[PDB]
Amino acid sequence: SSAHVLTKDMIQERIVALLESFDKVNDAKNITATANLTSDLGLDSLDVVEVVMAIEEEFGLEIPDHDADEIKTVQQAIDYVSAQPAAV
Amino acid sequence: KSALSAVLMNRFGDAFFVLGLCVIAYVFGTLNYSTIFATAYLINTDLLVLIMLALFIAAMAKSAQFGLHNWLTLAMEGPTPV
Amino acid sequence: SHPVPFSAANKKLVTSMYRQSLKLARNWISNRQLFRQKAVEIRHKFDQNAQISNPRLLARTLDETRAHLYEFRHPDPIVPPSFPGGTKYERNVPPRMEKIMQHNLYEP
Amino acid sequence: LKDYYYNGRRILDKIPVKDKQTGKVTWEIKREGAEKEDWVNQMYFLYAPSLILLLIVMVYKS
Amino acid sequence: VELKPSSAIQRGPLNKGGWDAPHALHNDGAIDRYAHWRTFYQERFKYTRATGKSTLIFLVAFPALIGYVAYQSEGLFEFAGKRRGESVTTRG
Amino acid sequence: IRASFDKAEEPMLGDYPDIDPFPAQLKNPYKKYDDQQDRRNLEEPLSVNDDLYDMWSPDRFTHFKNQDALKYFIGF
Numbered sequence A: 001s002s003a004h005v006l007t008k009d010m011i012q013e014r015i016v017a018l019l020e021s022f023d024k025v026n027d028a029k030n031i032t033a034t035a036n037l038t039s040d041l042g043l044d045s046l047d048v049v050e051v052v053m054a055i056e057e058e059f060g061l062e063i064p065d066h067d068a069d070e071i072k073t074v075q076q077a078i079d080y081v082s083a084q085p086a087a088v
Numbered sequence B: 001k002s003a004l005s006a007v008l009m010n011r012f013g014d015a016f017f018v019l020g021l022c023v024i025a026y027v028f029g030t031l032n033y034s035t036i037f038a039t040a041y042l043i044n045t046d047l048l049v050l051i052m053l054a055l056f057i058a059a060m061a062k063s064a065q066f067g068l069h070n071w072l073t074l075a076m077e078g079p080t081p082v
Numbered sequence C: 001s002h003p004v005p006f007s008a009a010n011k012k013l014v015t016s017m018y019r020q021s022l023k024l025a026r027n028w029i030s031n032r033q034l035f036r037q038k039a040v041e042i043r044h045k046f047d048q049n050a051q052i053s054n055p056r057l058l059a060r061t062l063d064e065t066r067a068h069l070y071e072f073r074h075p076d077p078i079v080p081p082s083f084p085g086g087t088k089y090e091r092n093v094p095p096r097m098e099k100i101m102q103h104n105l106y107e108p
Numbered sequence D: 001l002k003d004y005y006y007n008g009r010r011i012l013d014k015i016p017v018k019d020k021q022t023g024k025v026t027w028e029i030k031r032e033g034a035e036k037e038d039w040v041n042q043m044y045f046l047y048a049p050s051l052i053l054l055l056i057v058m059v060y061k062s
Numbered sequence E: 001v002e003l004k005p006s007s008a009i010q011r012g013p014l015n016k017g018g019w020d021a022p023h024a025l026h027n028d029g030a031i032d033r034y035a036h037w038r039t040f041y042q043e044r045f046k047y048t049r050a051t052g053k054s055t056l057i058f059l060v061a062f063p064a065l066i067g068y069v070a071y072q073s074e075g076l077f078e079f080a081g082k083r084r085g086e087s088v089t090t091r092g
Numbered sequence F: 001i002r003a004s005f006d007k008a009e010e011p012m013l014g015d016y017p018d019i020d021p022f023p024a025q026l027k028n029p030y031k032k033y034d035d036q037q038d039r040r041n042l043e044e045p046l047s048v049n050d051d052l053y054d055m056w057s058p059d060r061f062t063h064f065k066n067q068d069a070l071k072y073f074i075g076f
C-alpha cells in the first residue's frame, strides 16, 4: 500500500527545489551539494532557520537545536535527512 | 500507562459494583433478575438508592461519564479497530 | 551578565527563539496563509531588532521574547508520529538480537 | 560422569549419541528427544493422576 | 607445651561447588544504593514534625475514627428483606 | 525543585546524596540516553523518591500550574 522509498538523489532533488523556490538565495546555479548556506547562497542568520524549518516540513521531521545549528552545507542536510528512518 | 489508567479507573467502578452485589445479596437474598425485579417494588427506598448509587458509579466508570472519563481518550493509544 | 550582541551564543539563542516562534505560529494557526503572514511578521520584528548594540536593551528584549513565547505556548503541539512525543514512537521496536545466556547447569 | 555430561551439554550445546552400527559416539546437535528429566516419572505418573482422582472424588462427593 | 591446635587436623577451603554461570545482570550501583537505602530505611528513621504527623494520623486518629464508627454501628443495621415504611435501624 | 515530601527526608539521607529531583518526562527527549525509553544514563544518581519522578510515574502537565488548574476545574 505505502509503496514508497527514499533515496539520496530524491532528497537532493527535493532540497535543491526547496532552495530554488527561496527568494533570499543569491540566485540559482549556486545550489549544489558542496554549497554553503552562509557564504555561497548568501543567507542570513535566520534564513538558515527558515530553510531548516522547510526541511522539517518537507521530510516530516523534527530537528533539535543541537542538530539544527550544525547544518551549514547542503550535503550536510542531505546526510542528515538520509540518517533519519522516518524521513518520509 | 493508558491501559493501566483504563483498568484501574474501571476497578474503581468494579469495587462499587461489588458493594452493590453484597447489598443485593443481603436485602434480596439472591442475585437473580427474576426475584429482584419481582420484589423491588416493596423494598425500602434507601437500600435501593444505595444499590443503584453503587451500580451507577460502576456505570459511571465504564460509560466514561465525567468524574471517571479520563481513560477513554487515553485508550486511543490502542489500534483503531480496538 | 554579558550577552554579547554579535557572538555565537547570541546566534544560537536568537535562532532558537525564531524557531520556537515559527513552530508556535504553525501550531496555533490552522490556515496556511495566515501562518505565512505571521511568520513574515515575526521575521520583520526580528529584523527590526537585529541592529541592537547596547547589551542592556538587548537583555531586556530577550527577556521580552521569552515572556512572549511563554505567553503564546501551545498545549497540544504538532510532532511527527515517529518522533518522541508522537503516536507511533515506540510502537513495534525491533528486538535486540541477543543470544540466550544460561543460568543453570541442568535446566535449558 | 554426571558433571562431565552436563558441563559438556552446557558449554558445547551438544549431547552424545552413539548411532546404531558404528561403535563411536561423539557430541551431536539433535536435541528434539532422547532426553528426559529425573522428576518426570514421579510427578506425571503419581502426582497428576492423584489430583485428577481428587477432582473426581470432589465432584462425586458433591 | 605451646597451646596450639592439633597437627593431625588437615584443613582445606570451603568450596560450594556451584557452576559459575555467565554475567546475566550488569549491576548499576546507583540503583543498588537506592535499593539499600529504601530497604534499610528503618535504621535511619528519626521522629520529626513531618514523621510524627503521619504517625499520629495513621496510628491514633484513623483507628479512633474507624473504632467510633464500628462501635456506634455495632448492631444498628438489619435490612434483610426490609420493606417500605419499615425502619432499617434497630435503635436511635 | 524539591517538594515537601522530598525535603522532609533530609534528616534521614545520611551518607546518601541529596539530589535535586527533576522528572524524566520533562527531560529532553532528543538527547541520547543509555535507556532511551526511561531517559536515564547508567550511573545516574537516583533521588530517594525516584519512584515518583521516573517515566512510569504519573504524568505531569506543564501548560498550567496546578493551583490555577484547580481554579479552572472547580470554576467550570
Ligand SMILES: CCCCCCCCCCCCCCCCCC(=O)OC[C@H](COP(=O)(O)OCCN)OC(=O)CCCCCCCCCCCCCCCCC
Pocket: B001, B002, B003, B004, B005, B006, B008, B009, B012, B057, B067, B068, B074, F056, F057, F058, F059
Ligand atoms: C489517598 C488515600 C486514598 C484511600 C482511598 C482510595 C481512593 C482511590 C484510590 C487512589 C489511591 C492512589 C492511587 C495511586 C496509583 C498510581 C499508580 C500508577 O502509577 O498508575 C498511574 C495511572 C495513570 O498513568 P498516567 O500518568 O495517567 O499515563 C497516562 C498516559 N496514558 O493512574 C491510574 O491508573 C489511576 C487509578 C486510580 C483511579 C482513582 C480514581 C478516583 C477518582 C474519583 C472521582 C470522583 C467520582 C465520584 C465518586 C463518588 C463517590 C461517592
Ligand SMILES: CCCCCCCCCCCCO[C@H]1O[C@H](CO)[C@@H](O[C@H]2O[C@@H](CO)[C@H](O)[C@H](O)[C@@H]2O)[C@H](O)[C@H]1O
Pocket: E056, E060
Ligand atoms: C502520639 C502518641 C500519643 C497518643 C497515644 C494515644 C494512646 C491512648 C492513650 C489515652 C489513654 C486514655 O484512656 C482513657 O480511657 C479510659 C476508658 O477507655 C478512661 O477511664 C474511663 O474508663 C471506663 C472504662 O472504659 C471507666 O469505667 C470510667 O468510665 C472512666 O471514665 C480513662 O480516663 C483513660 O484511661
